[PDB]
From Swiss-Prot, chains A, B:
It comes from the Bacteria. This is Retron Ec78 probable ATPase. Coiled coil: none annotated. It comes from Escherichia coli. The chain holds residues 159 to 236 of 550 of the full protein. Probable ATPase component of antiviral defense system retron Ec78, composed of a non-coding RNA (ncRNA), a reverse transcriptase (RT), this protein and a putative HNH endonuclease. Expression of retron Ec78 confers protection against bacteriophage T5. At multiplicity of infection (MOI) of 0.02 cultures slow growth when infected with T5 but do not collapse, at MOI 2 cultures enter growth stasis. Signal peptide: none annotated. The lineage of its organism: Bacteria, Pseudomonadati, Pseudomonadota, Gammaproteobacteria, Enterobacterales.
Length: 78, 78
């Protein structure tokens, strides 16, 4: 998998070749929706954690008991 | 009790005499801090009470197990 990016204000553009990642994750999703399988857990825990905790923030969208909610904001920091 | 107000842009502004209502609503508070009594309730229920209800928590204002919270938005309709 290759993530490529050209600089801003440049006529030449570079594309990203993510096709084997697309193929493998498409395979995982297709086999899961046919007959339920265990999925890999990708997580990033950056310095973006150590935020203060407030119990009152409870309202959210996504139905937390949904299994595919486990991938909800799994990367990107805290 | 008399509530008075003149028009917009009027040079002379009429005052509102609320002194005996202030005294009668002050005697209740001053005796209530000493020895607990039964305070009266004042409520307004206009057409706005037909608002739809959604399962959300305000969790910002003051602590809904508190007697003077019963006067919170009591005459603002609904």
């Amino acid at each position: 998998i290759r993530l490529s990016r050209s600089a801003l204000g440049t006529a030449e553009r570079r594309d990203s070749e993510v096709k084997p990642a697309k193929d493998l994750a498409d395979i995982w999703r297709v086999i899961n929706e046919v007959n339920t399988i265990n999925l890999p857990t990708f997580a990033l825990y950056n310095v973006e954690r150590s935020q203060p905790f407030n119990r009152n923030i409870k309202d959210n969208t996504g139905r937390r008991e949904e299994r595919f909610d486990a991938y909800s904001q799994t990367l990107g920091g805290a």
